[PDB]
Design a protein around this ligand. Sequence first.
Ligand SMILES: [Zn+2]
Ligand SMILES: [Zn+2]
Ligand SMILES: [Zn+2]
Lengths: 186, 187, 596, 72
Amino acid sequence: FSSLPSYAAFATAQEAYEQAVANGDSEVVLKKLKKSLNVAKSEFDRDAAMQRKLEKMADQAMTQMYKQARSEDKRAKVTSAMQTMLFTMLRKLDNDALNNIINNARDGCVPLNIIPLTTAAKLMVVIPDYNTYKNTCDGTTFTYASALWEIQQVVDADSKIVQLSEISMDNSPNLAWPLIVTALRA
Amino acid sequence: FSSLPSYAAFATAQEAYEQAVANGDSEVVLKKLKKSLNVAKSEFDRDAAMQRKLEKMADQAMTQMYKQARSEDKRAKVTSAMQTMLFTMLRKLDNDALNNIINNARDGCVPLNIIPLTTAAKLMVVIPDYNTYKNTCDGTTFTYASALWEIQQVVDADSKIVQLSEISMDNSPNLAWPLIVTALRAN
Amino acid sequence: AVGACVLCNSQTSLRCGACIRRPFLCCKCCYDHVISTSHKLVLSVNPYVCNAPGCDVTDVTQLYLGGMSYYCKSHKPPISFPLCANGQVFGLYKNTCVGSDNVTDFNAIATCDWTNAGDYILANTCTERLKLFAAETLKATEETFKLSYGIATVREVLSDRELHLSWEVGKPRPPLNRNYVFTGYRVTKNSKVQIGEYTFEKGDYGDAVVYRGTTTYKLNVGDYFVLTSHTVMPLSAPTLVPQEHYVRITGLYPTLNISDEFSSNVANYQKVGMQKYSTLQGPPGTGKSHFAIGLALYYPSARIVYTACSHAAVDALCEKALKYLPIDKCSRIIPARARVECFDKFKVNSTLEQYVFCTVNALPETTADIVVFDEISMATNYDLSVVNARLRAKHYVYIGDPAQLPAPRTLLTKGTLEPEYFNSVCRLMKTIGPDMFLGTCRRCPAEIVDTVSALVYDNKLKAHKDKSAQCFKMFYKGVITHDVSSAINRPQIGVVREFLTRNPAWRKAVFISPYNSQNAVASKILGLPTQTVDSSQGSEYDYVIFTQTTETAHSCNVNRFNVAITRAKVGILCIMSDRDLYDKLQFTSLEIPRRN
Amino acid sequence: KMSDVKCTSVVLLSVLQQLRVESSSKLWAQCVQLHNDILLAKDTTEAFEKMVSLLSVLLSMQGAVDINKLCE
RNA sequence: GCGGUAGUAGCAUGCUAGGGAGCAG
RNA sequence: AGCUGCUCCCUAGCAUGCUACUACCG
RNA sequence: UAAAAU
Ligand SMILES: [Zn+2]
Ligand SMILES: [Zn+2]
Ligand SMILES: [Zn+2]
């Protein structure tokens, strides 16, 4: 602290005492330098002790409003930060088994149930367009989740069976397309 | 801080002191009217700092009796609530069946564990798997607690209805498995 | 209490309180707005006033930050800072502030009066943020102006619902329509409590006005009816989402063999799905609306929602939907208001119906696959933001024609609004080009399409459906019995009086007039169920009866003439004051005693 | 490398739970068991199998807009 | 020059009251 | 949504204690 | 001075 008003008065008082102690004058006129200088150390230290408390209420309001703002913005964005965190960590993981199903899933090829692990349960995945059908179904083997599944039943949106030999480039425009391929793991 | 018997005394003392400082005649003036901020601030200490605690203690007394009033209202609210609960709970039991079993007690008191056994009018079975449903509530009427109960409304963990036609053995692996069969007492 | 600046989207906490909508502004932007405008009030975490008891100085540019509060210079503490200093104002996040130099257009929007064409002309050529700002502030200005109207009280009781009122003298009386409502309060000595809302109707003679009460409180002599105002909710989503293209059809799966009646629309049905949003502009009564349900069944599994700003429009297109689609169709229009009621189909509370029909202000917040907003020539940027906020879908499709009717915009009283500036999507359709074009009449007589295409459009219409029966006797219209600013002329009705029964087979025509009150005069001495030219626009009938007024700038509007004549099947008539429109008119001239 | 997949499985189950997946007891039981079994794994090749099985649950329903969060 | 009370400012301790968070059985 | 035990941190009040300097008396 | 809102 410094530039406070009463600091001027206290500074002039102690400068007057500097002058008196350099001159070495009278001691009874020195009763003006401890009956009017000690009046300064209390005309000031009661105005320096009223910005020391304001300067503390400022801090304990600042440090509280800050966290009251954040601690509330944090809770108003969980359903959208959790997802970005999830996919950041997934991309960083780097595993082709997951990258395959994620990419596939981008281009509307999702599964319809939990991918099973047994060497014999079923998997039913959707296939929306032909250019998808080519890259994955070569004959009767299905390449999903970095494995090989033997295709057993294709069935279009008609909910009626489609023959596997009927699916090709030319005759494609006729099938209700989003299909549901069913298969079993190798 | 303003309209007290001491502020005006200090005011007139320092007014006389103003007159005496504008004069500046003798050192007796200086002494006798420096005895005017030396005598008029004790009263400005007492009757201007004392009542700075009067308001303190009055306001804390006020807040304490505020909180006591609120804490005496919440008591009334909770006792009304629990009285309502007690009186709405008995409006479900005063069957003549309960009086029938109490009047046969050779004393007037009966174990508690048998009252819902012999006087309730609704049973609820919770069944883990199909093999247990087979042995217990199989069909649409079964017998338990020496009485004959009849099934109506069957639900599942998600609490969505189920018909007894779906509860077969090959369709069993397609339901939320703890089923909750609610039956009534049929005579 | 924190947000984003309206110009540069930086962090801030300052609002220019003198502006009606209280928009967030950053430091530099608030300084620029307040150094050049009469707006000099600011509000941060707490208002910026001189916190000395008894002082009321509020100009920010002269206030000073003191101890835990802001102080006048007269009431300044020994230690303090000036708030407005060095080209900025003091708020949160001061040294991380970005200053956009759109303060010119911002001040234009903030201090304008929406009275001359320049205000709307600049409302729809700024950035999207300023676009939404101008939209909500304009609606706010209009509905707060509505407060300056007059008030009415009782005068004497005459019946149970037709009585005599007293409008307060000296201030404008509001128009008399069933959407201008006043809440009624009785003030006895003592006793000033609500008695209900009311909507009125001027019946058969003066000064009587039949009325409709929200509850049967028996009206006395001491009550009054004061108009109840409305509030405005701020916007969030933009007017139109940014476009994305694709290389293959996404989300939608076509068909091959259903109802080739929509034949020429297939290649266009694909182009709809291979984009993010597209527009179809169409001359009056062509393949529009038809196209909507055509694409609807072309993509059968596709969830689709339909919308328009005018009730009669959504209802007429719900009818045209009923004509073709599985039912399996609902029109979630309105639970129980807009007292001119509508459909008779299903539900307003389910939102699993594959086909939902409603009006913009009453949309529920649903997911969809296609949103077919209809007649964009009648909507404003406000409404477009409303739809883009409530719904999200995959594709968007807008259908309309800027050459027809715009939004009324009551307060504008000098200049003209070209369709380019009706809203955002009309601009888009006329700046680069409707990205989808269809233009030849299916509906109304070939000759009248020749008439309309001869005048509003350069001639580019053809169709079928020929004669007969069209007439324009240039009919003198007598006394303009003008109670409200909506015109009334019954000597003109002397022609349906000249043709009441001599039309022995012309029994189900449709009567439309530019003025609402003279149309209630068609509801005064009755000939047939009548409509307005605004409740038309997306509605078609067989034979049409029409009455005008004097050659006011109102009825003389060529666009309302367009949307009045182009809504028939094979017959119409035009009874016009007519200085040169019967020199526009391509029909057979008739006279008043010419009944054969 | 296994700590990576364990923390990722924590984040995945939390997302699934935020998407109201515990409204169907069968699905929630399946995911809960896959999660607790991943956390107790002790060789990083079983964990990835159960992680692909667990992520299939999120890839099934259409509530998370995958093409957007895959802006890379 | 010192004893007594009455003050302000500063300091330490201790105790009550209130709130937040961490570990253990 | 439990019963305990220990520890850190922040705030408030009071009295006590301590010290400095100012006013009244002895 | 035209449409018309849990
Ligand atoms: Zn302003
Ligand atoms: Zn800014
Ligand atoms: Zn001031």
